[PDB]
Structures are given as structure tokens and as C-alpha cells.
Amino acid sequence: LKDAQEKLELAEKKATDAEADVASLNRRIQLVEEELDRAQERLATALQKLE
Amino acid sequence: LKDAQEKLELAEKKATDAEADVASLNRRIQLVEEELDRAQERLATALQKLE
């Protein structure tokens, strides 16, 4: 039981940290997508003014 | 020990799933980052053309 509970603890800690990493990466994805959209809009406006 | 092993299996499956999510989300992060880099390079070229 000592080994089994230690394995349980390590697996649960790893899964929780992985979930936190997933949430952080997803919010990073949405942030970078918003920045990309703003950059594309700026590019379009700049090209029109250039022409 | 039986319950501990079952929870170990569940926790390791969930952690592997979240690790795959991490891999996918980091791939998306890098790809959108590259697209944003291209967009900002285009923006810099556009400002140069404005000048």
C-alpha cells in the first residue's frame, strides 16, 4: 500500500500539473490568435493606404 | 492497493491525455506565432513603403 499510494500521489500531481499547463496553453492560443487577427487587419489597412 | 492501482490507472490516463493536449496546444502556439511573425514583417515592410 505504501508504494501504491506513492504512485497515486505522483500520478495525481502530474495530471493536475498537466491540466494547468493545458489551460495556460489554451489561453495563450486565444491571446496569440487575437494578436494575429489585429496584425492582419493592420496589414490590410497599410496595404490599402500604400496603393 | 486495488483502489490505489485503479486510481493510478485513471490518473495516468488523464495525465497522458493532458500531455497530448499540451503537445497539440504548443504546436498551435508555435504555428500561430510564426503567422504573427510573418504578419508583423509585412507590417514593417508596409511602413517602409509608407515612408
Curated annotation (Swiss-Prot), chains A, B:
Induction: Induced in stimulated quiescent cells.
Subcellular localization, as worded in the UniProt entry: Cytoplasm, Cytoskeleton
Family to which this protein belongs: Belongs to the tropomyosin family.
Note: The sequences of cardiac and skeletal muscles are identical.
Domain topic, free-text comment: The molecule is in a coiled coil structure that is formed by 2 polypeptide chains. The sequence exhibits a prominent seven-residues periodicity.
Function per UniProt: Binds to actin filaments in muscle and non-muscle cells. Plays a central role, in association with the troponin complex, in the calcium dependent regulation of vertebrate striated muscle contraction. Smooth muscle contraction is regulated by interaction with caldesmon. In non-muscle cells is implicated in stabilizing cytoskeleton actin filaments.
Quaternary structure, from the entry: Homodimer. Heterodimer of an alpha (TPM1, TPM3 or TPM4) and a beta (TPM2) chain. Interacts with HRG (via the HRR domain); the interaction contributes to the antiangiogenic properties of the histidine/proline-rich region (HRR) of HRG. Interacts (via N-terminus) with LMOD2 (via N-terminus) and TMOD1 (via N-terminus).
The protein's name in its UniProt record: Tropomyosin alpha-1 chain
